[PDB]
Write an enzyme that holds these catalytic residues in place. Structure first.
Site, PDB file in Angstrom:
ATOM      1  N   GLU A   1      23.517  53.838  63.873  1.00 13.51           N
ATOM      2  CA  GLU A   1      24.552  53.201  63.319  1.00 13.51           C
ATOM      3  C   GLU A   1      24.990  52.736  64.430  1.00 13.51           C
ATOM      4  OE1 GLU A   1      24.239  51.313  60.435  1.00 13.51           O
ATOM      5  OE2 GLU A   1      22.902  51.984  59.735  1.00 13.51           O
TER       6      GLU A   1
ATOM      7  N   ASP B   1      25.285  42.628  61.955  1.00 12.42           N
ATOM      8  CA  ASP B   1      23.800  43.503  62.055  1.00 12.42           C
ATOM      9  C   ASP B   1      23.418  42.850  62.428  1.00 12.42           C
ATOM     10  OD1 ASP B   1      23.177  42.431  59.181  1.00 12.42           O
ATOM     11  OD2 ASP B   1      23.190  45.067  58.566  1.00 12.42           O
TER      12      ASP B   1
ATOM     13  N   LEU C   1      28.136  48.380  55.513  1.00 17.07           N
ATOM     14  CA  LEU C   1      27.213  46.623  55.509  1.00 17.07           C
ATOM     15  C   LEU C   1      28.597  45.728  54.944  1.00 17.07           C
ATOM     16  CD1 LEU C   1      26.732  44.712  54.632  1.00 17.07           C
ATOM     17  CD2 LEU C   1      24.650  45.414  53.965  1.00 17.07           C
TER      18      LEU C   1
ATOM     19  N   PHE D   1      20.958  54.594  53.368  1.00 15.45           N
ATOM     20  CA  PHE D   1      22.702  54.421  53.408  1.00 15.45           C
ATOM     21  C   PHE D   1      21.830  52.715  54.359  1.00 15.45           C
ATOM     22  CE2 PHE D   1      26.418  54.987  55.284  1.00 15.45           C
ATOM     23  CZ  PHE D   1      26.052  54.112  56.832  1.00 15.45           C
TER      24      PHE D   1
ATOM     25  N   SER E   1       4.801  55.594  50.429  1.00  7.68           N
ATOM     26  CA  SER E   1       5.405  56.022  51.082  1.00  7.68           C
ATOM     27  C   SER E   1       5.792  57.385  50.379  1.00  7.68           C
ATOM     28  CB  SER E   1       6.088  55.757  51.807  1.00  7.68           C
ATOM     29  OG  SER E   1       5.751  54.345  52.518  1.00  7.68           O
TER      30      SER E   1
ATOM     31  N   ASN F   1       2.388  55.165  56.316  1.00 13.65           N
ATOM     32  CA  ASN F   1       2.347  54.077  55.356  1.00 13.65           C
ATOM     33  C   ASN F   1       3.662  53.720  55.905  1.00 13.65           C
ATOM     34  OD1 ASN F   1       3.320  53.604  52.676  1.00 13.65           O
ATOM     35  ND2 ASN F   1       1.461  52.817  53.250  1.00 13.65           N
TER      36      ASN F   1
END
Ligand code: CL
Ligand code: CL
Length: 159
Positions: free
Chosen positions: A11, A20, A32, A101, A114, A129
């Site tokens: 990040e 972002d 965020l 996250f 998945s 996948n």
């Protein structure tokens, strides 16, 4: 190597609001926030201070802690996530936490196919996948590190 270090890598750290890869106002360690003034507002409320679009490393680190806790808690409270998490070794747990996250609980919960393969311990296959996703095409390098972690169970992708 731990989830914190793993996410700090993925990040980055930015002390001034920023957008972002998706256009969203974000700040600190991938925290965020959201438009602009509205985001400066979100930010001041989150920090509890008049920020002026900017924060300390210490505050960005506080958000981060809150954020990682929130994610683990969200996985654990989630019906489709919990069972996946519980079934995994500690490295791969890190990998799921990363995804959550990043994309929210809700978004991870839609990786239905998945998630099931991860449960069945079908590594190679889940990797393939996971890659057919908008997620991977939008942020391919991060996505590949996370996918490698699920494939290998090691932290090789982050070293
Ligand atoms: Cl917050
Ligand atoms: Cl990337």
């Amino acid at each position: 190597m731990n989830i914190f270090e793993m996410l700090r890598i993925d990040e980055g750290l930015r002390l001034k609001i920023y957008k972002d890869t998706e256009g969203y106002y974000t700040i600190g360690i991938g925290h965020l926030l959201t438009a602009a003034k509205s985001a400066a507002a979100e930010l001041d409320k989150a920090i509890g201070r008049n920020t002026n679009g900017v924060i300390t490393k210490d505050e960005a680190e506080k958000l981060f802690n809150q954020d990682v806790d929130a994610a683990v808690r969200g996985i654990l409270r989630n019906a489709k996530l919990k069972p996946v998490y519980d079934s995994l070794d500690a490295v791969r747990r890190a990998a799921l936490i990363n995804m959550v996250f990043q994309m929210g609980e809700t978004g991870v919960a839609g990786f239905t196919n998945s998630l099931r393969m991860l449960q069945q311990k079908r590594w190679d296959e889940a990797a393939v996948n996971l890659a057919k996703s908008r997620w991977y095409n939008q942020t391919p390098n991060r996505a590949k590190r996370v996918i490698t972690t699920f494939r290998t169970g090691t932290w090789d992708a982050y070293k």
